[PDB]
Write a protein that binds this ligand. Structure first.
Ligand SMILES: [Ca+2]
Ligand SMILES: [Ca+2]
Length: 183
């Protein structure tokens, strides 16, 4: 098909962190030819083999259906509901939809970062500077997608709204199970 791949940074702006050191972030990755879908995120997840806080994790999700280059609304809704329940405290999603040829490179980068979970050289979690949002920004930067400028203090809820100023918006509500894509 030659259809561009999809990278969908997702932020859960109403996610509650509760204890110190707003929102959580993850990323959906979709093969534009096949609809094969991956989800990765970085956060304060348990790891018995590392004493350094912060780990990448992969969450299994359904694949989407691509029809004439587009993701069908229903198949994306199924993934968004999965991600909200499994990673997002059953809250709403604010996202952007990015396009390019990068599926294998993104998959390799994410698996490579996950391979660092037990490394003595793993960069420690930092709520301000090395967190769920900066993981995704660093991925998009690495793909050549030129994400929005990263401030010294990265707040997922604030950053995603900045990112949306220059990209396609994705809004999803878990309670109503409704998706809206907009400029
Ligand atoms: Ca918004
Ligand atoms: Ca926008």
């Amino acid at each position: 098909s030659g259809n561009d791949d999809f990278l969908i940074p997702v932020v859960f702006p109403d996610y509650l962190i509760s204890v110190a050191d707003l929102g959580h972030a993850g990323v959906i990755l979709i093969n534009g030819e096949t609809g094969v879908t991956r989800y990765y995120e970085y956060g304060r997840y348990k790891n018995p083999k590392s004493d350094i806080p912060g780990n990448v994790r992969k969450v299994g999700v359904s694949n989407v259906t691509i029809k004439s280059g587009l993701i069908t609304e229903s198949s994306l809704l199924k993934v968004l509901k999965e991600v909200s329940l499994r990673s997002g405290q059953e809250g709403r999603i604010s996202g952007v939809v990015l396009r390019g040829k990068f599926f294998s490179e993104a998959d390799s980068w994410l698996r490579g970062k996950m391979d660092l979970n037990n490394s003595p050289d793993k960069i420690p979690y930092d709520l301000d500077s090395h967190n769920c949002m900066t993981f995704v920004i660093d991925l998009a930067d690495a793909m050549g997608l030129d994400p929005a400028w990263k401030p010294p203090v990265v707040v997922p809820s604030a950053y995603i709204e900045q990112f949306q100023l220059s990209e396609i918006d994705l809004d999803y509500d878990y309670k109503t199970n409704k998706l809206t894509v907009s400029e």
